Structures are given as structure tokens and as C-alpha cells.
Amino acid sequence: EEVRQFRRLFAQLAGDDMEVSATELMNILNKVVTRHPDLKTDGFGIDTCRSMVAVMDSDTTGKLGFEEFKYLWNNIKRWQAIYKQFDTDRSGTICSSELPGAFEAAGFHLNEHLYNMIIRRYSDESGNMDFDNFISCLVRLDAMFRAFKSLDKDGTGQIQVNIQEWLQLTMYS
Amino acid sequence: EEVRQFRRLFAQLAGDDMEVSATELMNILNKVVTRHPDLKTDGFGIDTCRSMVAVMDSDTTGKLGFEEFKYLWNNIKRWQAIYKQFDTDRSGTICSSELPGAFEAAGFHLNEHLYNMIIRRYSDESGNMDFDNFISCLVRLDAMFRAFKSLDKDGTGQIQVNIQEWLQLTMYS
Ligand SMILES: O=C(O)/C(=C/c1c[nH]c2cc(Br)ccc12)SS/C(=C\c1c[nH]c2cc(Br)ccc12)C(=O)O
Ligand SMILES: O=C(O)/C(=C/c1c[nH]c2cc(Br)ccc12)SS/C(=C\c1c[nH]c2cc(Br)ccc12)C(=O)O
Ligand SMILES: [Ca+2]
Ligand SMILES: [Ca+2]
Ligand SMILES: [Ca+2]
Ligand SMILES: [Ca+2]
Ligand SMILES: [Ca+2]
Ligand SMILES: [Ca+2]
Ligand SMILES: [Ca+2]
Ligand SMILES: [Ca+2]
């Protein structure tokens, strides 16, 4: 049903090597947002898309297999709905006061300091975040929570990170 | 003298707020790299410059002050010299086989696994890395080593962090 449409989508996007490259992902995300005039964006750039692919590429093939792509695509589908719901002035962007509500709706309850850091890193000079920056941020945030969770086997809220794992987790992202 | 020139050029670049934004940095790196055609590039994009600024913004103003800028600039100047030196076929690009000499000359000794990841994230389908990607990689890799070492004064090879700390450390595009 939806399982067959999705499988078709992935097959046609992934093409001859049966995995989704950064460039394939970039072209599809740009194709789709082009149809949503309520999402303001200067575009999905290659560098951003290589970042998204690396962070999602948990088997280190270089590209996104079916499950990796499914996980990402379904996140974006939920996250775009959130963005539109929380763009309560229809600017096409998420401003500083809209951001906490949006991230919280996505399951990320941060604190003022962390929201300010993300606005600082991801939002523009007026404190507005456009749609590709918003998705780029959430992919990584979601990945970073997941990485923490894997390392926190005993549920102490502290993790021990060796230098090798640190370099992999930050450089292959 | 060189010191006076550097201060003038920074003052001119930083303008009214006396700090260098990601957009200001993008513009000057694109203007300078165009004068060095041996450094082949598809350009410095805004996302890559926002990341550089973020990783260099140690007083969290959101932009690079004089000392933060100088430090990034001096690294870029050393690193461009290494890129030219280790580009032995003169392709304007750093191939997989040229990369470790270059990283070794920058002071970094990474295992094969980490090279594979960096090559997948930053080089093309032929294993060639262009100049903006080489610089983006090195600015990040340096910053990540420096971050880890700051938190591991004793050289245990490990750091311990909570979720807040982990997010502050990693939430870098
Ligand atoms: O449920 C799904 O898989 C959907 C996929 C989808 C929607 N439009 C598409 C266009 C192409 Br060319 C392929 C696949 C498409 S419909 S949900 C939706 C918005 C939505 C879903 N993913 C999005 C990504 C981006 Br970038 C922008 C908008 C997206 C809606 O109902 O509006
Ligand atoms: O060759 C040039 O264009 C140089 C420009 C230059 C020197 N000092 C500058 C200060 C600012 Br705020 C802007 C431009 C300046 S002199 S060579 C140099 C560094 C260097 C060499 N190649 C480079 C490429 C890129 Br992209 C960035 C810097 C590069 C230097 O003297 O530091
Ligand atoms: Ca493919
Ligand atoms: Ca993969
Ligand atoms: Ca808004
Ligand atoms: Ca954007
Ligand atoms: Ca400025
Ligand atoms: Ca600063
Ligand atoms: Ca070469
Ligand atoms: Ca490039």
C-alpha cells in the first residue's frame, strides 16, 4: 500500500547502485520543497546533504541503503509538518520564539542555553531558520541523541567517549 | 608591518561590528581563492562558512573577533601551502594517495578507518578532494582534536560527558 509506493520511491531515487547518494538526496529534497511555497529555503546544498548522508550512514557504505533512507525520509516527513504547524506567522521560517515549540514537538526538550546555541549556529542574523537549515539541524540532533543513547548502556546520563570514537562521530557527520 | 597590513585587512573585512560573520568570511574566501587557480574549488558555500565560524567562535559572539579570525586565517595559510605541496600531479585537487602526506604534514595521524570516512565525506567519486572541502575538513578536524584535548588534560584518551555537554560539543554543521 504505502509500503509499495515507498519501495518504488526508493528504488527510483537510488537508481543503478541501489543506494541514495548525497546528490540524489539533494535533488529529491529540492524537487519536493519546490512544491511547498510555505517552506522558505535557499535550497538544499551539497555540503549539507553530504553531512546528512554521513550522519545517517551507519554501515559506512558512503550512501543510504533502504532502512537508512527510510528512517531519514520519515523523519523529514514528520519534521516538515511540525515546521509548518509552528510557523504561526507564515514567514516560511522558524524564528527564535517559534523554535522551542517546534523542537519540543519533535521530541527534543532542550533548555534556553542549548536553544540559544542552535539559533547561533543554524539561524540567520535575525534569528530566523529556514527549512533546509531546520532539517539539517534536526537530523544531526536526532543522530547525536541516538549516539549518546548507544554509549549510555547503564543509563547513568554520562558517557565515556574515547578519542577514536570521538573522531569518527564528529568527522563522519 | 605584515602585522599592520593584517590589521587593516581585518578591519576592512569585519566592518561595523568589528567581527567577521559567516557571510563576510564566505566572501573573502571566495575572493582570495579565485586569485589562486591552482586551488581548484566549486566555491565556499554559506553552510560551510557557518560551520567554520561556529567551530572557531570560542567567546560565543556568533562571529569571529580579531584573534579568532587571525587564528583561522593563519591555519588556512599553512594548510593551503600544504595542499599545493602535496598535490604532486598538479591536478589542483588532493587525491586519496596524496591525502595522508598532507595530513601528516598538518600534524594529524589517523588510522585507515578514519581516512576512509573522511574520504567518503569530503572527496569525490574518484577520491579527489578540492580546496574548500580540504579546508572545511581540516578546520573541523583541528577543532575536534583541540576540543577533546582540552577535556582530557591528563591524556587518558577518554572524556566523560552528559547530554548537555555532548550537544554543546557536537551540534556543529
Ligand atoms: O508520505 C510520503 O512519503 C510523501 C512523499 C512525498 C510527498 N511529496 C513527494 C514528492 C516526491 Br517527487 C516524492 C515523494 C513525495 S507526502 S507528505 C507531505 C510533505 C512532505 C513530505 N516529505 C517532504 C519533504 C520535503 Br523537502 C518537503 C515536504 C515534504 C505533505 O503532505 O505535504
Ligand atoms: O594572495 C592573496 O590573495 C593574499 C591576500 C591576503 C593577504 N592578507 C589578507 C588578509 C585578508 Br582579511 C584577506 C586577504 C589577504 S596573500 S597569501 C595568504 C593566505 C592565503 C594564500 N592563499 C590563500 C587562499 C585562501 Br581561500 C585564503 C588564504 C590564502 C597570507 O598572506 O596570509
Ligand atoms: Ca544511487
Ligand atoms: Ca549506508
Ligand atoms: Ca515564522
Ligand atoms: Ca538554508
Ligand atoms: Ca561584520
Ligand atoms: Ca567570536
Ligand atoms: Ca593531486
Ligand atoms: Ca568543494
Author numbering:
A (entry chain B), B (entry chain A): 96 to 268
Relevant lines from the article:
Calpain-I and calpain-II are the two most studied members of a family of calcium dependent cysteine proteases that currently comprises fifteen identified gene products in humans. These heterodimeric proteases are composed of a large subunit with a molecular mass of ∼80 000 and a small subunit of mass ∼30 000. Selective inhibitors might not only be potential drugs but should act as tools to explore the physiological and pathophysiological roles of calpain-I. α-Mercaptoacrylic acid based calpain inhibitors are potent, cell permeable and selective inhibitors of calpain-I and calpain-II. These inhibitors target the calcium binding domain PEF(S) of calpain-I and -II.
To test this proposal, the oxidised form of 3, (2Z,2′Z)-2,2′-disulfanediylbis(3-(6-bromoindol-3-yl)acrylic acid), (4), was generated and the single crystal X-ray structure of 4 bound to PEF(S) solved. Compound 4 was then added to preformed crystals of PEF(S). The electron density map revealed that the ligand adopts two different conformations in each subunit of the PEF(S) homodimer, therefore a total of four conformations of the ligand were observed in the asymmetric unit of the crystal structure. The unique geometry of the disulfide bond is observed in all of the conformations ensuring that both pockets of the hydrophobic groove of PEF(S) are explored. One of the 6-bromoindole rings of 4 is bound in the hydrophobic binding pocket that also binds 3. The second indole ring of 4 interacts with a hydrophobic groove on the surface of PEF(S), where the α-helix of CAST inhibitory region C binds with PEF(S). A greater number of interactions form between 4 and residues of PEF(S) than with 3 and the protein, including a number of electrostatic interactions and hydrogen bonds. An electrostatic bond forms between the carboxylate group of 4 and the positively charged guanidinium group of Arg130. The dihedral angle of –91 in chain A is close to the optimum dihedral angle and in this conformation 4 makes strong interactions with both hydrophobic pockets of PEF(S). The restricted geometry of the disulphide bond facilitated a larger number of favourable binding interactions with PEF(S) so that the two aromatic rings of 4 interact with the hydrophobic pockets that bind Leu 660 and Leu 656 of calpastatin.
